[PDB]
Ligand SMILES: CC(=O)N[C@H]1[C@H](O[C@@H]2[C@@H](OC[C@H]3O[C@H](O)[C@@H](O)[C@@H](O[C@H]4O[C@H](CO)[C@@H](O)[C@H](O)[C@@H]4O[C@@H]4O[C@H](CO)[C@@H](O)[C@H](O)[C@H]4NC(C)=O)[C@@H]3O)O[C@H](CO)[C@@H](O)[C@@H]2O)O[C@H](CO)[C@@H](O)[C@@H]1O
Ligand SMILES: [Ca+2]
Ligand SMILES: [Ca+2]
């Protein structure tokens with residue numbers, strides 16, 4: 001069971017924003033609704049999110065970043081990016097932007113983009 | 129830097145928007161996000177005074193970004209800060225009474241009242257002045 005306007009998928013609820021904001025404000029926006037900028041835990045979830053993103057032609061932020069530009073990607077839950085997910089980057093990605101780097105769903109895979117760019121976002125929280 | 133969008137009011141470096149439509153608390157939170165704002169999180173007594181005057185003169189019940197949804201009795205602002213002991217004085221007499229389970233805060237008369245989150249109320253957004 002999920003709140004109205006939230007999507008249920010494999011035990012979790014996902015909120016697809018209908019507006020755009022920078023990565024930081026997106027992290028904040030999800031906490032406002034007792035959720036978290038989506039942290040992908042399984043390949044099934046990734047396929048699901050990538051699909052929703054591509055069908056709506058909307059570049060969307062996920063809770064993954066390398067704010068120090070040290071090439072060290074971490075999820076907002078504190079966990080690191082497993083090498084198993086490195087395959088989700090689009091061709092040539094991730095290419096540092098020269099500024100704080102954040103991950104976005106773009107077409108078929110993920111892109112590295114500047115964190116202050118305005119993108120749609122996706123929040124996630126357990127179903128009830 | 130005291131510039132605000134049309135229909136928004138300025139006070140101490142921030143812009144406030146009072147809605148003309150009504151939505152439940154949850155939808156109000158997301159409504160403010162759509163306009164690059166946040167359901168009002170009150171940080172100072174002075175701000176509370178400014179807002180209570182605006183709301184009482186409009187004669188409307190309006191949502192603020194405060195709730196005790198996570199833990200009944202412990203109020204939290206949507207920005208992650210807890211309701212301070214000093215701000216508890218703003219609840220109207222006899223409130224919060226959790227009548228039929230009320231976990232969202234609204235401006236009501238001269239102070240605040242907890243109401244059911246699924247109730248349609250006007251709302252107030254806040255964002256930095258530019
Ligand atoms: C006279 C005046 O100042 N008018 C102002 C007005 O002031 C407010 C107004 O409130 C009138 C009622 O408005 C709504 O109906 C409710 O907010 C109601 O409160 C009860 O119901 C809500 C749920 O709908 C509860 O959240 C609330 O706690 C309260 O519940 C009742 O609580 C008692 C005590 O525990 C309990 O015994 C009852 O069973 C319970 N009832 C229910 C339904 O649960 C308001 O009473 O007038 C009040 C004067 O007495 C003021 O105190 C209010 O602030 O504000 C507007 C806005 O500016 C202004 O235009 C108007 O002139
Ligand atoms: Ca409750
Ligand atoms: Ca309550």
Ligand SMILES: [Ca+2]
Pocket residue numbers: 223224225226227230241242243
């Ligand atoms: Ca009440």
